[PDB]
Design a protein around this ligand. Structure first.
Ligand SMILES: C[Se][C@H]1O[C@@H](C)[C@@H](O)[C@@H](O)[C@@H]1O
Ligand SMILES: C[Se][C@H]1O[C@@H](C)[C@@H](O)[C@@H](O)[C@@H]1O
Ligand SMILES: C[Se][C@H]1O[C@@H](C)[C@@H](O)[C@@H](O)[C@@H]1O
Ligand SMILES: C[Se][C@H]1O[C@@H](C)[C@@H](O)[C@@H](O)[C@@H]1O
Ligand SMILES: C[Se][C@H]1O[C@@H](C)[C@@H](O)[C@@H](O)[C@@H]1O
Ligand SMILES: C[Se][C@H]1O[C@@H](C)[C@@H](O)[C@@H](O)[C@@H]1O
Ligand SMILES: C[Se][C@H]1O[C@@H](C)[C@@H](O)[C@@H](O)[C@@H]1O
Ligand SMILES: C[Se][C@H]1O[C@@H](C)[C@@H](O)[C@@H](O)[C@@H]1O
Ligand SMILES: C[Se][C@H]1O[C@@H](C)[C@@H](O)[C@@H](O)[C@@H]1O
Ligand SMILES: C[Se][C@H]1O[C@@H](C)[C@@H](O)[C@@H](O)[C@@H]1O
Ligand SMILES: C[Se][C@H]1O[C@@H](C)[C@@H](O)[C@@H](O)[C@@H]1O
Ligand SMILES: C[Se][C@H]1O[C@@H](C)[C@@H](O)[C@@H](O)[C@@H]1O
Lengths: 311, 311
């Protein structure tokens, strides 16, 4: 039970997504290795072979980040496991970013996380990937070329990488949180705040997760020394689980959210409300990408059953 | 928790295996796309970058078949999704078989099943794969070049393909059984016997399985209108399940066997005893291949924890 379009979507494809409020873009890999863009603009569209923005190694990790939908960056691996960047800016179309020119080689099993730094009109990027020594390496662009940032230490080979960024309204710089899996299979957090920089502490957010389980995170409603974060990962019950940080309660909830196929990748986006949108494969038309939604109006509800090009 | 060697094994690699009694060969894909051979000769060895027999598309299906260990054939897909064949004959070493020359193009998500026809000294091959119309196509070599055999009809896009072959001691030709998954997610059997040829009947062996779950089969103790078959697949509980055919009882048992990683591929071999050996990934050193064994002496027992090159 599939469709011609759904068959084009790679099984266990990497998934990434960006948005400006409820204006959405979702990136995935097709069965021939091309990275495609589906979009939501008061309705779903595209995701076809005419909507290719990049070509990457089969089974590549995918990450994306944006400033609204004015600047979009999509990260993947070349067949030589070099980090590369597909870039879009308003009124310039899609092009190759400078990242690949830096020739950052990572482990073949590396994932990728990516954020624009929040709370500034400047375009500042932090990318996170896994080197062949299994450490999680930050790579950065601040208008003075691509270079290595901070190394966050050793993770499980092939760990998922979740990352989110915001700016506290009472701080003068960005806060970054990065989640990954350690050798003991725990899910942990590294943290960056202004002034303190990277905290030394690793915080456990889940005791045991499947090896190389997908990890994805978002945040909403930043305020005065306050944030709200959601981290998603694929658990051993073949569902996405959610971990909640809420100002006033800290890390205080772990729940299953929705079923997925074995080994599904995941992507999360959000906007103020909060509105949450989760993307994953749950077996709809075998290989189509499905959507899960959260909003105040209706709470947890499945969304678009089969993203373009499935139907 | 991994090892340098284990890290070389592709996560969710295709797996195939051949044997002459307890002389074993196991094939898998490394993280750079090369197909490697590990062997058991009174002890496990090889599986290193010096033990490459082929190069294939990343995430390729793998199938293998042999006449004892005198003739071995290993099947995979090129980056253009053409069926290709790595071949070994005693005292000739490894080489490229003629299969790729036939330019059989299949669906990007195609699996592969392969057998030498049993009960004859002749070298006769039947390969099974999935075309872009999602039908399961037989391809054959009988000493008059590669050509298409019988088409077995429509299967779920990306179905596992299990196949086994024997000769009844009271028949003058080979019997073939092929298992795959249909659109309704059932696991079914197609059957070939001498004279009758391919039976029209599809036999359900399992009511519902995960989409594109791995499927692998073996047989032992052929006799007078009698056979014993074992079919393995990855079930929704992230374990390999076994389905038993036994002469006198028919299809009469379904059981879990052993845990695997989400989306593990599987391979099965056997020899008279019966002795069974199952290969799969269960998360040992994250990406190492593990072994499960069955014999009369000790019944169900885990075998080699981490195949070469893991340790
Ligand atoms: C009716 Se809720 C609506 O929200 C939009 C932003 C998209 O996520 C749609 O897929 C969804 O149905
Ligand atoms: C004209 Se719709 C436009 O939206 C931009 C933000 C990008 O996502 C483009 O790929 C897309 O074509
Ligand atoms: C000047 Se276009 C520039 O944009 C930056 C934000 C980075 O994405 C670079 O890789 C890209 O070339
Ligand atoms: C002085 Se560049 C600085 O930027 C911070 C926001 C973090 O990304 C650090 O890792 C980095 O060294
Ligand atoms: C000491 Se900074 C603090 O920041 C919060 C938003 C969470 O990330 C906590 O885990 C962390 O300890
Ligand atoms: C008020 Se707690 C509430 O927060 C929402 C944003 C979602 O994450 C829900 O799953 C959660 O229960
Ligand atoms: C001690 Se049972 C023995 O059987 C051999 C044929 C191999 O399968 C070994 O891995 C296994 O330990
Ligand atoms: C000398 Se061991 C020998 O065994 C053969 C049957 C093949 O498996 C070869 O690849 C291997 O080197
Ligand atoms: C004469 Se070598 C020959 O062996 C046959 C059994 C097939 O495997 C052919 O593809 C191969 O070239
Ligand atoms: C006459 Se060729 C014959 O061989 C049988 C054993 C089966 O493989 C059939 O599919 C094939 O047509
Ligand atoms: C009518 Se042939 C018979 O052969 C047995 C070995 C099994 O494959 C049965 O499912 C099949 O019906
Ligand atoms: C005697 Se039934 C017995 O047969 C063995 C070969 C294995 O398949 C076992 O799992 C099964 O219970």
């Amino acid at each position: 039970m599939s469709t011609p379009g759904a068959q084009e979507v790679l099984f266990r494809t990497g998934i990434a997504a960006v948005n400006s409020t409820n204006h959405l873009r979702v990136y995935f890999q097709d069965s021939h290795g091309s990275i495609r863009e589906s979009l939501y603009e008061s309705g779903w569209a595209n995701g076809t072979a005419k909507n290719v923005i990049a070509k990457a190694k089969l089974g590549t990790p995918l990450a994306a980040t944006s400033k609204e939908l004015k600047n979009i960056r999509v990260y993947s691996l070349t067949e030589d496991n070099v980090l590369q960047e597909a870039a879009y800016d308003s009124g310039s179309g899609w092009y190759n970013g400078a990242l690949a020119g830096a020739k950052f080689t990572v482990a073949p099993y590396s994932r990728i996380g990516s954020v624009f730094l929040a709370g500034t009109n400047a375009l500042q990027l932090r990318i996170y990937a896994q080197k062949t020594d299994n450490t999680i390496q930050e790579y950065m662009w601040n208008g003075d070329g691509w270079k290595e940032g901070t190394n966050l230490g050793v993770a499980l080979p092939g760990t998922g990488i979740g990352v989110t960024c915001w700016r506290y309204t009472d701080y003068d710089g960005p806060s970054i949180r990065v989640w990954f899996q350690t050798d003991n299979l725990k899910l942990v957090q590294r943290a960056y705040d202004p002034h303190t920089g990277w905290y030394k502490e690793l915080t456990t957010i889940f005791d045991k997760a499947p090896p190389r389980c997908a990890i994805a995170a978002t945040n909403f409603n930043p305020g005065k020394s306050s944030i709200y974060m959601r981290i998603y990962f694929v658990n051993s019950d073949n569902t996405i689980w959610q971990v909640c940080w809420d100002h006033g309660q800290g890390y205080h909830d772990k729940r299953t959210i929705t079923p997925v196929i074995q080994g599904s990748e995941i992507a999360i986006i959000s906007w103020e409300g909060p509105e949450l949108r989760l993307y994953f494969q749950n077996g709809t038309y075998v290989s189509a990408i499905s959507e899960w939604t959260w909003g105040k109006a209706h709470g947890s509800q499945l969304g678009r059953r089969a993203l373009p090009p499935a139907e």
